[PDB]
């Protein structure tokens, strides 16, 4: 044996094992969903309540990399934070070099190449977080992208990462997301989150929602408290 | 520029096809200086391709042997060993059809040392068979009942020509 | 060891030709055959 | 010698190939080409039969990894 | 990174260290050369190894290299490393001449090269050098000198030395037959011929199988010569004749 | 001489997956809105069993 | 980043370099080649054979001219041959930029062997897998050289490297001599390449280069077709 | 067959082989895709397939074809991230060549430089030798079209018709049998042959939404991606 020690040796069947171990490390995080609407995208995160001592709003899993791009993560928190920092630095460097907000199709590529640089040499280890990027522009539409530890960047109408990826994406696809605008999407997201993680696995949790689109002048931010109050009240009826 | 060489080869081919022998000799006597303008390989290939067909066509009691003579001489000049080896073998086989007695032995005897000291072994088979036939045809049965066996010996070992074993048999 | 081999084989050559004694050319043919078979491996 | 084997089939194209097959594969080659002809209800064996039969019997892919050379 | 390391520098529980030991076992084979000095002029004899019928036979030298106007050296072991070391010391001597405008003494040059060699077995994690070579020369401080080197780095001054595969017999027989300061460039050569005879199992001492180099002192030349092949065979036959007389006498 | 022909049986092509699935889906009391094409679409690399 | 900084080739308990020997064993399995010289010029012959008809044999070559009068061929591994050729080109330019004179062949061989050996004592690498044959014509006398992964270099009158190379050596011994012609040299080289050639010999499966006291050149397919003719 | 560390790093085996390179070649087949390239009389064509297992995935961002230069195109086989890295390297090298010498790069030199860059990886003991294969098509003046292929071990070569992927062998067989006809070639013939080769190897009888085609011609050297409409035109015209 001994072929799975370093990230520089191929197995006889022809694949790298460390990256597979990393992906299995990802598959134990909580859960996160992101879907695109007519004119924007919506993220949604469920945060488990480990104990009563912590506060709400702690260890935010939603990061606003730039003034107009949002990020959601799943994996190890520290690696996620480091990647967020490098992405933010890349965006600012690009603005200074040229002079306008960076498009997604370039920022995602830069982050992907930088991540992929950590799977060749034996002096470092591969990362342990998988993340999602979203944004909207008035002249560019709504953009969603997903990136994994291996270094693959793909585009989605709507996707989900975490423990129950398959279960969630079963009900992601039923919705007609091609037309209906993302003002009623939020209720759908609350409903689709409350139908997973049974009470047997854990008792209580909390919910985070984000927002982007021309509905908020293209900026990316958090949803108001009353809106999520109404959405949660609505999703309370779906358990019937 | 080169077209005249192809034309010469075409003329030789047509002379062989129609069935003329004198015109080959005339061309060979008219073309010998021309060799000193092309690469050595092309000239040697032309000489070989002319002599082969010329001798092969038929037998002339007067014209034939001087051609081989002059060809051996020109090869001795230009200094190509294997070309001269092949032409000398052709001459020693050509003698027997003219029913000679002595020289067919002396030339082969001289050729044996150089041939057995070099690389090839097929020409050993050829000259041994020729020597056996000339020994038998000159009414000396004791002399020849050994060469043929040693030639078959070298042949059976490593050989590639179909026409060799049949003639040996 | 090959000398015993060539002596053994030289008899078969006289056997094929239905003779009663072994001539020298039989020896030399046997010699060449032994050389040739040894030339392979 | 037992098959009608058409008239124009060429064998020298197959003896000159290099593949060091055994002696019990020649038999299977000829047998397979014959059966291939029987399938389509034609009772004279043609060249395409020999081609497809040869390819069927041999089955050697490449085993000739190239950058070593 | 540590799973693939070999540790070419550590000691051993028994006290010694193994890399130079293996290097010595390898330097034991592959070649034969020896040197002798008794009067004005010193001799080196080298047994040629590449003696096939298809060699161009050029460059005038195959194991003898000039290093200065009066420095020459042979070598045994891996050839390419020998090229490396010779090139390295060449400009050492040139820079000494540049600094002092005076021909360099032998011993300083030998010590500098030995320091360079030892630095590899002190630290750095590389394989050592598999070369054992000789040195002959003349200088104003002590006249004629001979020296031997070692892959470990140690050296010494000697009068008769062999480094070849059968050097043991060479040492034993040079011990019993030598004369202090009398063997001029006429009597030492016959002894060298017979010594080389005993070393090599092949008899008759093929003229092309050996090479001899001599160093002599001259007022403005400091002659370094390599005698040709038209004069070795006469030495061989002279030794044969004297040995025949001694054989028939007893 | 002993075993003359060797016959290879592989994993089903997509068209083959449709063909196979139609059978074992036969007798089930289902409802007439089933699109087998999607189920084919996912079943990359399944054996018949 | 950072490399490894410790050599991977070390003396064995019997005092034998294992890696360089394994490299030689790999070299022995390459494409055969032969080289000859006789009093008027030097000839290099080597065999090439593409696996299928799809390869465009007009795109790559085996014989590579370093300069107008120095020729190089190889036997063994594929890729690193190009790296060595590039280094040799560079060394040639570096030398010419000092003395304004073409490099003598011996110096070029010395430098190349120096690189090849130096490469086995560095940190965290493995040696090359090639054997080189170098030909040149300077100061009238033609020169031939053969290097080696170990770095040792020799001068040969005529030699053969590759598969079944011992038989090529014996055959050349039984045929080669000291006084010949360039044309006879070409013919005998082609003959010895045909000792274990492929199924058939054509004009595109053989690469031949020549260098006389007039220069080094690679022969076009026309003359190769002619020489293959009137032969064998 | 092996002893020590022949199975973990790129060092020579006792028999003369080395395995860490031989493993990349079988690592190629992990994706499960195939591509074919054909050179015509005055045209060059490349055909590839794409697979979209689910509807959520945006079908417009999975193209394996990339545009290196206004006159040179490339097609990719193998893993994903390594492919992107090699593509970026090629683009950068061509741009630098243009800056340095002031005229366009011939296709052969570019392929040589990329393969030479690959060759260093199999020389040291820190990296992985990049398991993804490259195909390039272009037009060279006074030479017509040209097609080249580059592999992970560093062996580049110019072909007349090639295939890379899971089914290399049978496709090469089919192409050899077809090219033996020794006839003239035109654009329609090239495209028809290239389509039908893959069609019969996989035995699909596909639809115009599963195959991508790239072409270049000596009338307008600009590499272009065929629109779905004319792809459908070619496909329906092929079926007599």
GROMACS .gro file of N, CA, C and O in nm, chain A residues 188-238:
model
  204
  188UNK      N    1  -4.002   2.955  -0.122
  188UNK     CA    2  -3.965   2.823  -0.169
  188UNK      C    3  -3.839   2.773  -0.100
  188UNK      O    4  -3.830   2.656  -0.063
  189UNK      N    5  -3.741   2.861  -0.082
  189UNK     CA    6  -3.617   2.820  -0.017
  189UNK      C    7  -3.643   2.782   0.128
  189UNK      O    8  -3.592   2.681   0.177
  190UNK      N    9  -3.720   2.864   0.200
  190UNK     CA   10  -3.750   2.829   0.339
  190UNK      C   11  -3.821   2.695   0.346
  190UNK      O   12  -3.788   2.610   0.430
  191UNK      N   13  -3.918   2.673   0.257
  191UNK     CA   14  -3.988   2.545   0.254
  191UNK      C   15  -3.893   2.430   0.226
  191UNK      O   16  -3.901   2.324   0.289
  192UNK      N   17  -3.801   2.449   0.131
  192UNK     CA   18  -3.714   2.341   0.091
  192UNK      C   19  -3.608   2.312   0.196
  192UNK      O   20  -3.551   2.203   0.198
  193UNK      N   21  -3.578   2.409   0.283
  193UNK     CA   22  -3.484   2.382   0.391
  193UNK      C   23  -3.555   2.314   0.507
  193UNK      O   24  -3.502   2.221   0.568
  194UNK      N   25  -3.676   2.358   0.540
  194UNK     CA   26  -3.742   2.300   0.656
  194UNK      C   27  -3.784   2.155   0.635
  194UNK      O   28  -3.830   2.092   0.730
  195UNK      N   29  -3.771   2.101   0.514
  195UNK     CA   30  -3.813   1.964   0.487
  195UNK      C   31  -3.696   1.866   0.496
  195UNK      O   32  -3.707   1.753   0.449
  196UNK      N   33  -3.585   1.908   0.554
  196UNK     CA   34  -3.467   1.824   0.569
  196UNK      C   35  -3.415   1.840   0.711
  196UNK      O   36  -3.468   1.919   0.790
  197UNK      N   37  -3.311   1.764   0.744
  197UNK     CA   38  -3.256   1.752   0.879
  197UNK      C   39  -3.368   1.731   0.982
  197UNK      O   40  -3.412   1.824   1.050
  198UNK      N   41  -3.416   1.608   0.990
  198UNK     CA   42  -3.523   1.573   1.082
  198UNK      C   43  -3.489   1.612   1.225
  198UNK      O   44  -3.373   1.631   1.259
  199UNK      N   45  -3.592   1.622   1.309
  199UNK     CA   46  -3.572   1.656   1.449
  199UNK      C   47  -3.496   1.548   1.523
  199UNK      O   48  -3.438   1.575   1.628
  200UNK      N   49  -3.496   1.425   1.471
  200UNK     CA   50  -3.426   1.315   1.536
  200UNK      C   51  -3.275   1.340   1.535
  200UNK      O   52  -3.206   1.315   1.634
  201UNK      N   53  -3.221   1.387   1.422
  201UNK     CA   54  -3.079   1.415   1.416
  201UNK      C   55  -3.041   1.531   1.508
  201UNK      O   56  -2.942   1.523   1.581
  202UNK      N   57  -3.119   1.638   1.507
  202UNK     CA   58  -3.093   1.751   1.595
  202UNK      C   59  -3.223   1.824   1.625
  202UNK      O   60  -3.321   1.816   1.551
  203UNK      N   61  -3.222   1.898   1.736
  203UNK     CA   62  -3.342   1.966   1.783
  203UNK      C   63  -3.365   2.098   1.710
  203UNK      O   64  -3.465   2.115   1.640
  204UNK      N   65  -3.273   2.193   1.724
  204UNK     CA   66  -3.298   2.328   1.676
  204UNK      C   67  -3.179   2.384   1.599
  204UNK      O   68  -3.065   2.339   1.615
  205UNK      N   69  -3.209   2.484   1.516
  205UNK     CA   70  -3.112   2.547   1.428
  205UNK      C   71  -3.157   2.689   1.399
  205UNK      O   72  -3.256   2.738   1.454
  206UNK      N   73  -3.083   2.756   1.311
  206UNK     CA   74  -3.115   2.891   1.267
  206UNK      C   75  -3.095   2.899   1.117
  206UNK      O   76  -3.032   2.813   1.055
  207UNK      N   77  -3.148   3.006   1.057
  207UNK     CA   78  -3.151   3.021   0.913
  207UNK      C   79  -3.089   3.154   0.872
  207UNK      O   80  -3.111   3.255   0.939
  208UNK      N   81  -3.012   3.153   0.764
  208UNK     CA   82  -2.958   3.275   0.705
  208UNK      C   83  -3.002   3.284   0.560
  208UNK      O   84  -3.004   3.184   0.488
  209UNK      N   85  -3.034   3.406   0.517
  209UNK     CA   86  -3.070   3.435   0.379
  209UNK      C   87  -2.991   3.555   0.329
  209UNK      O   88  -2.961   3.647   0.405
  210UNK      N   89  -2.959   3.553   0.201
  210UNK     CA   90  -2.888   3.662   0.137
  210UNK      C   91  -2.973   3.718   0.024
  210UNK      O   92  -3.082   3.669  -0.004
  211UNK      N   93  -2.922   3.821  -0.042
  211UNK     CA   94  -3.003   3.890  -0.142
  211UNK      C   95  -2.912   3.961  -0.241
  211UNK      O   96  -2.813   4.024  -0.201
  212UNK      N   97  -2.947   3.952  -0.369
  212UNK     CA   98  -2.878   4.028  -0.472
  212UNK      C   99  -2.970   4.039  -0.592
  212UNK      O  100  -3.059   3.956  -0.612
  213UNK      N  101  -2.951   4.144  -0.671
  213UNK     CA  102  -3.030   4.168  -0.790
  213UNK      C  103  -3.059   4.316  -0.807
  213UNK      O  104  -3.028   4.396  -0.718
  214UNK      N  105  -3.117   4.355  -0.921
  214UNK     CA  106  -3.151   4.495  -0.940
  214UNK      C  107  -3.261   4.539  -0.846
  214UNK      O  108  -3.283   4.660  -0.830
  215UNK      N  109  -3.332   4.444  -0.784
  215UNK     CA  110  -3.430   4.479  -0.683
  215UNK      C  111  -3.367   4.556  -0.568
  215UNK      O  112  -3.436   4.631  -0.498
  216UNK      N  113  -3.237   4.539  -0.547
  216UNK     CA  114  -3.162   4.615  -0.449
  216UNK      C  115  -3.050   4.695  -0.514
  216UNK      O  116  -2.942   4.709  -0.456
  217UNK      N  117  -3.073   4.744  -0.635
  217UNK     CA  118  -2.974   4.821  -0.709
  217UNK      C  119  -2.846   4.741  -0.731
  217UNK      O  120  -2.735   4.792  -0.720
  218UNK      N  121  -2.862   4.612  -0.761
  218UNK     CA  122  -2.748   4.527  -0.790
  218UNK      C  123  -2.658   4.496  -0.673
  218UNK      O  124  -2.575   4.405  -0.684
  219UNK      N  125  -2.669   4.567  -0.561
  219UNK     CA  126  -2.581   4.539  -0.449
  219UNK      C  127  -2.615   4.403  -0.389
  219UNK      O  128  -2.723   4.348  -0.412
  220UNK      N  129  -2.520   4.348  -0.315
  220UNK     CA  130  -2.539   4.222  -0.246
  220UNK      C  131  -2.545   4.249  -0.096
  220UNK      O  132  -2.460   4.321  -0.043
  221UNK      N  133  -2.645   4.194  -0.029
  221UNK     CA  134  -2.655   4.218   0.115
  221UNK      C  135  -2.743   4.110   0.178
  221UNK      O  136  -2.769   4.006   0.118
  222UNK      N  137  -2.785   4.136   0.301
  222UNK     CA  138  -2.867   4.045   0.377
  222UNK      C  139  -3.013   4.088   0.366
  222UNK      O  140  -3.044   4.203   0.333
  223UNK      N  141  -3.103   3.995   0.393
  223UNK     CA  142  -3.247   4.021   0.384
  223UNK      C  143  -3.293   4.090   0.511
  223UNK      O  144  -3.231   4.072   0.617
  224UNK      N  145  -3.398   4.171   0.506
  224UNK     CA  146  -3.451   4.231   0.628
  224UNK      C  147  -3.520   4.129   0.716
  224UNK      O  148  -3.563   4.022   0.671
  225UNK      N  149  -3.531   4.163   0.844
  225UNK     CA  150  -3.581   4.069   0.944
  225UNK      C  151  -3.728   4.035   0.920
  225UNK      O  152  -3.769   3.919   0.939
  226UNK      N  153  -3.809   4.133   0.882
  226UNK     CA  154  -3.951   4.108   0.861
  226UNK      C  155  -3.975   4.014   0.745
  226UNK      O  156  -4.066   3.930   0.749
  227UNK      N  157  -3.894   4.026   0.639
  227UNK     CA  158  -3.913   3.941   0.522
  227UNK      C  159  -3.889   3.795   0.558
  227UNK      O  160  -3.969   3.707   0.525
  228UNK      N  161  -3.779   3.767   0.628
  228UNK     CA  162  -3.754   3.629   0.667
  228UNK      C  163  -3.853   3.583   0.772
  228UNK      O  164  -3.885   3.464   0.778
  229UNK      N  165  -3.905   3.675   0.854
  229UNK     CA  166  -4.012   3.637   0.945
  229UNK      C  167  -4.133   3.585   0.868
  229UNK      O  168  -4.188   3.479   0.900
  230UNK      N  169  -4.173   3.658   0.764
  230UNK     CA  170  -4.287   3.614   0.684
  230UNK      C  171  -4.257   3.484   0.613
  230UNK      O  172  -4.344   3.395   0.606
  231UNK      N  173  -4.136   3.469   0.561
  231UNK     CA  174  -4.100   3.347   0.490
  231UNK      C  175  -4.104   3.226   0.582
  231UNK      O  176  -4.154   3.119   0.545
  232UNK      N  177  -4.051   3.240   0.704
  232UNK     CA  178  -4.054   3.130   0.799
  232UNK      C  179  -4.196   3.098   0.841
  232UNK      O  180  -4.234   2.981   0.853
  233UNK      N  181  -4.277   3.202   0.862
  233UNK     CA  182  -4.417   3.178   0.894
  233UNK      C  183  -4.484   3.098   0.784
  233UNK      O  184  -4.559   3.004   0.811
  234UNK      N  185  -4.454   3.131   0.658
  234UNK     CA  186  -4.512   3.058   0.546
  234UNK      C  187  -4.465   2.914   0.542
  234UNK      O  188  -4.546   2.821   0.528
  235UNK      N  189  -4.334   2.892   0.553
  235UNK     CA  190  -4.279   2.757   0.545
  235UNK      C  191  -4.322   2.671   0.662
  235UNK      O  192  -4.308   2.549   0.656
  236UNK      N  193  -4.372   2.732   0.769
  236UNK     CA  194  -4.432   2.653   0.876
  236UNK      C  195  -4.555   2.575   0.830
  236UNK      O  196  -4.591   2.476   0.894
  237UNK      N  197  -4.621   2.618   0.722
  237UNK     CA  198  -4.738   2.545   0.675
  237UNK      C  199  -4.706   2.426   0.587
  237UNK      O  200  -4.791   2.339   0.569
  238UNK      N  201  -4.584   2.418   0.533
  238UNK     CA  202  -4.553   2.312   0.438
  238UNK      C  203  -4.538   2.176   0.503
  238UNK      O  204  -4.534   2.075   0.432
   0.00000   0.00000   0.00000
